[PDB]
Design a protein around this ligand. Structure first.
Ligand code: FMN
Ligand code: URA
Length: 338
């Protein structure tokens, strides 16, 4: 059995960098339609990233991005069952503010909220607003994140912090109310330091799916994460990111994938800098008939450590509908749904 989440398009054109891919702005109403349809099909969770600078080109790729906490606060108000995760770019928000924002969305959602904590990697997202700490941050960023999460855990657990470190000084810091349920923390650590952080402080770790139609190719990453979790004695599973391009036949899905690769927005791809393609940032891609994708997702569910998948689509509104109507009913790992 495996959990399914939707990675909501908080940035324009989702995860395809192509003039032949669907062209759309991230609105609230689009993300509302996506999350309500996901909830209707018993998706377990919805997550938004945070992306503070785009890649330009013909498609202005990720030049247009909403902010994650405010988006997910709006989505929490128009849902009732799906788990809601927002991403904190921890260089941009003081931990006491994230603590209070999480208590707030806990109140909006009736205990369905969690936080994805990221260090940030892309210097320009931070340099552009004068808040990059310097190139020491590449090596020290999980030290920073360790202090950050200690402040969050004090505030959510007791309502107060006296934490004092290299990066934070709390003098009887107060945040109440405390969340109604234990606050879920997720991390997207791929490095040794990142997985060591996740093993100590996260409920689950997000990793990248790998290759095109090689669903189990990420297995060594999920194995590293299981070894990290052994070092803390904590149950910290892997949720794996894939793009699904499904149709009625294998040949039809392959034709769509090829059509997207042929439109690659090369100018946007240079800023960024059966194989994976830069057209979806070399994402793990599952391309097939509804039945072929259901079989491949059942193979993901068999990989040691894999507890769920985070899904993008080529078209979210039609991709969620065909997932719910044609793919999910054939998945052995979703036989637990009503
Ligand atoms: C599903 C997923 C979501 C991510 N979201 C973001 C994000 O919103 N913002 C960001 O700066 N980095 C994000 N990242 C980058 C991770 O935090 C990334 O794997 C990490 O920065 C690289 O691993 P390392 O930090 O251990 O080297 C994401 C990664 C994954 C797998
Ligand atoms: O940095 C990011 C954010 C979302 N999706 C990715 O593949 N990378």
């Amino acid at each position: 059995m495996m959990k399914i989440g939707v990675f909501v398009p908080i940035g324009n054109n989702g995860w395809l960098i192509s003039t032949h891919a669907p062209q759309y702005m991230p609105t609230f109403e689009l993300n509302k339609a996506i999350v309500q349809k996901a909830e209707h099909y018993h998706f377990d969770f919805a997550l938004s990233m945070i992306k503070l600078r785009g890649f330009g080109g013909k498609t202005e790729f990720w030049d247009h991005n909403l902010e994650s906490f405010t988006l997910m606060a709006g989505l929490a108000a128009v849902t009732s069952r799906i788990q809601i995760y927002a991403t904190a770019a921890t260089l941009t928000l003081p931990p006491a503010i994230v603590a209070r924002m999480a208590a707030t969305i806990d109140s909006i959602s009736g205990g369905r909220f969690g936080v994805n904590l990221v260090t940030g990697w892309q210097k320009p997202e931070y340099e552009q607003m004068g808040i990059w700490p310097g190139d020491d941050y590449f090596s020290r960023r999980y030290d920073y994140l360790t202090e950050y999460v200690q402040v969050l855990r004090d505030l959510w657990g007791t309502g107060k912090s006296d934490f004092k470190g290299d990066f934070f000084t709390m003098n009887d810091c107060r945040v109440s109310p405390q969340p109604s349920v234990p606050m879920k923390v997720i991390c997207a650590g791929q490095s040794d330091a990142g997985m060591a952080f996740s093993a100590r402080y996260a409920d689950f770790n997000f990793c990248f799916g790998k290759g095109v139609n090689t669903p189990t190719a990420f297995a060594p990453t999920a194995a590293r994460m299981k070894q990290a979790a052994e070092q803390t004695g904590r149950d910290v599973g892997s949720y794996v990111l894939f793009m699904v391009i499904a149709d009625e036949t294998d040949d039809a899905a392959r034709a769509k994938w090829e059509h997207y690769k042929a439109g690659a927005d090369e100018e946007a791809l240079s800023w960024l800098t059966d194989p994976t393609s830069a057209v979806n940032i070399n994402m793990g891609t599952l391309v097939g008939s509804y039945a072929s994708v259901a079989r491949m997702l059942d193979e993901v569910a068999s990989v040691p450590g894999a507890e769920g998948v985070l899904l993008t689509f080529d078209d979210f509104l039609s991709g969620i509908e065909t997932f719910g109507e044609r793919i999910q009913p054939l998945m052995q790992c979703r036989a637990h749904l009503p």
